[PDB]
């Protein structure tokens, strides 16, 4: 995360770290949506241009974390993966369209002060909150700059951007399964996700029921925090039918 700040303790208890078993290293962010299911970006698991194609046994999820590098004894919980599910129409060839994946844990994780699931949006909450100017929150342990790395989880609040502005900021073909967020060059403030934040959540706190909803998944950006560029996020609600189908079928 670029130009963010240290998270407070328990500020993002749905935050998940995808961790490589060997060598032991951070792979991506992710989020906890129930005691058995974790949501992430498809490109965290499958990205052929970079020879990336992880299997269940390659990975661990670490839940309840704050420190990036420390083993947080008595606080974090580490889970093995039972199964990975990638959206069948995930477009890794062109533009990361439908950049979404689910991971089912081998065993349910115990909730605690530091571990707790985020809500997924319903149609009404999405319609109400996914509007230009409305701010969401992005969290992760990714790099602090494009070109270094944080001691603890980072957080940044960023405004959703008008679709035509998103489209005009890039040569990449944007789709309805994406939204973009970030400050404009003339807005002064800045901030973005970066390498390593992939798969983490873009959340919003509903003013109607005071609950946190995951509206987006950290997907892509041309560099990190560049003037005139924006971060692009998977539109979780648009893909919720697929999420539900998977959970109903394999839960």
């Amino acid at each position: 995360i670029v130009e963010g700040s240290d998270a407070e303790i328990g500020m993002s208890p749905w935050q998940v770290m995808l961790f490589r078993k060997s060598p032991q290293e951070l792979l991506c962010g992710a989020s906890l949506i129930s005691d058995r299911w974790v949501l992430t970006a498809a490109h965290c698991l499958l990205y052929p241009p970079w020879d990336k194609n992880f299997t269940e046994n390659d990975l661990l999820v670490r839940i309840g974390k704050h420190s990036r590098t420390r083993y947080e004894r008595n606080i974090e919980k580490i889970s093995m993966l039972e199964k990975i599910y990638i959206h069948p129409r995930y477009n890794w060839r062109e533009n990361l369209d439908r950049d979404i994946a689910l991971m089912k844990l081998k065993k349910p994780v115990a909730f605690s002060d530091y571990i707790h699931p985020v809500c997924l949006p319903d149609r009404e909450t999405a319609a109400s909150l996914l509007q230009a100017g409305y701010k969401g929150r992005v969290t992760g342990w990714g790099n602090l700059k494009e070109t270094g790395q944080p001691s603890v989880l980072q957080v940044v609040n960023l405004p959703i951007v008008e679709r035509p502005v998103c489209k005009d900021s890039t040569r990449i073909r944007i789709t309805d399964n994406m939204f973009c967020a970030g400050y404009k060059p003339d807005e002064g403030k800045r901030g973005d996700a970066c390498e390593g934040d992939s798969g983490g959540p873009f959340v919003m706190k509903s003013p109607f029921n005071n609950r946190w909803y995951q509206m987006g998944i950290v997907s892509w950006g041309e560099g990190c925090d560049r003037d005139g560029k924006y971060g692009f996020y998977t539109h979780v609600f648009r893909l919720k039918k697929w999420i539900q189908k998977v959970i109903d079928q394999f839960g």
Binding site: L26, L60, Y71, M80
Partner: peptide
């Protein structure tokens, strides 16, 4: 860079 995690999670 990362602190070793308990071997139980690697077995």
């Amino acid at each position: 860079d990362f602190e070793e995690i308990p071997e139980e999670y690697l077995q």
